[PDB]
């Protein structure tokens, strides 16, 4: 099964909040022990509020972080700090990105949310796992 890093395409309303899930699929029996990647978003339409570990993440209070580096640019990091049996084993949501949709944003327009540059994932052997990337968006309705 192929390994995929994807960002959902979600609907939301100008003036409202929205969650944009970032997902992994095709995690092997070797799991995921490390991750780093950048997420860009259309800051002319979206205001970043926070980012939370998704349900597949082990011990997120220790292992996971997300930081807004600048407007439109997030950095995401995961490590199994145990380096032993804390790898991610289950496909699903890896991060939930929480935005407020700007009230000025036009109905029917799209706010792109994308992976930027090179993402890195390491399995439980610390071997790189190359992800197929699919980008997403907030579809304003």
């Amino acid at each position: 099964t192929g390994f995929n890093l994807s960002i959902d395409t979600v609907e939301g309303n100008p003036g409202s909040s929205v969650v944009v899930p970032v997902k992994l699929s095709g995690i092997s029996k070797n799991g995921i022990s490390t991750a780093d990647f950048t997420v860009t978003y259309d800051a002319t339409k979206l205001e970043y509020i926070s980012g939370d570990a998704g349900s597949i993440v082990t011990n997120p209070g220790v292992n996971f972080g997300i930081n807004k580096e600048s407007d439109g640019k997030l950095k995401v990091l995961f490590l199994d700090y145990t380096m032993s049996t804390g790898y991610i084993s289950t496909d699903g949501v890896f991060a939930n990105l929480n935005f407020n949709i700007k009230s000025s944003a036009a109905i029917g327009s799209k706010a792109e949310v994308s992976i930027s540059g090179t993402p890195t994932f390491g399995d439980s052997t610390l071997t790189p796992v190359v992800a197929k990337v699919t980008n997403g968006a907030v579809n304003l309705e």
Partner: protein
């Protein structure tokens, strides 16, 4: 070079993992030619939890360099 403990050309979460294994006492030697140049990010010529903390800040974009 500084931060690139596996020598692959980029500083990433696999370097962070290798640093964790070194701290945990599970890895004795980095693939880098010079473990200190690669692994010491605060300038005491040793590798410890503080260098790891610094790499985390870098990978999170909280700093732009060491």
């Amino acid at each position: 070079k500084p931060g690139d403990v596996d020598g692959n050309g980029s500083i990433n979460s696999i370097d962070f993992a290798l640093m964790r294994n070194y701290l945990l006492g599970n890895l004795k030697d980095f693939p880098a030619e010079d473990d200190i140049k690669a692994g010491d990010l605060n300038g005491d010529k040793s590798i410890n939890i503080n260098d790891f903390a610094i790499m985390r800040m870098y990978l999170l974009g909280m700093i732009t360099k060491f």
